[PDB]
Amino acid sequence: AIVKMSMISSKVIGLVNPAGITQPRRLTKAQTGDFVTGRPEDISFLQLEKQADFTVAKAVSDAIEARLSFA
Amino acid sequence: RTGLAEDGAKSVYERLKNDRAPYETRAQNCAQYTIPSLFPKDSDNASTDYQTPWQAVGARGLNNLAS
C-alpha cells in the first residue's frame, strides 16, 4: 500500500482552473524567464493528501518489522 | 491385575480422560494465544494452518522462559 501510494504521488498533473485567465499553451511555449500573462493561483497540482493514513501505516509496519526482526 | 486395574488400562484411561478435559482446554487456549503449533488439538491434524497470534508477545515470553 505504501509503495503504491508513493507511485501515485510520483505522477504530476497540472490542474488549471478554467475560471482563471492562465492558459497552459503560453506557459509551455516559453523559455526561461519570458514574462507570460497569468496568475499563479490559476495553476495548481493535485496531491495525495492521504498523510495521516501514511503515518498510521508506517507505525504499524514498523511495529511488525520490529517484532519480526527480534524474532 | 485387580486393585485399580481389574477393569483394564483402556477403561481407566477412558474414565480419566474426562477429568483431563479442562486442563486440555486451558492448555489449548494458552497455546492459541502463544505459539499455537505447540499444543495442537486432537482433531487438529495435517493440512491445518495455525493463525499466528496478533500480540506476538506470549510466544516471545514462552521461548524466553523455556530457555
Side-chain angles (χ1 to χ4, degrees), chain A residues 67 70-71, chain B residues 54 56 60:
Chain A
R67 59 166 77 164
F70 155 70
Chain B
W54 306 78
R60 298 226 304 290

Side-chain angles (χ1 to χ4, degrees), chain B residues 4-21:
Chain B
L4 308 169
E6 47 266 30
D7 57 358
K10 184 177 179 180
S11 52
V12 65
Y13 177 88
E14 279 199 83
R15 277 195 319 96
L16 279 167
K17 175 160 55 144
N18 304 330
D19 291 21
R20 184 184 60 183

Side-chain angles (χ1 to χ4, degrees), chain A residues 10-56:
Chain A
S10 297
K11 190 193 184 76
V12 64
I13 305 193
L15 285 190
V16 55
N17 192 0
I21 57 166
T22 311
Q23 295 278 337
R25 94 187 190 244
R26 40 175 45 104
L27 259 57
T28 301
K29 310 173 144 63
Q31 314 282 2
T32 48
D34 186 74
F35 288 98
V36 160
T37 182
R39 275 191 260 90
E41 50 256 26
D42 283 8
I43 301 294
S44 188
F45 308 107
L46 61 83
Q47 309 210 313
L48 187 70
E49 65 161 10
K50 182 170 277 260
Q51 283 133 1
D53 280 299
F54 198 104
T55 63
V56 63

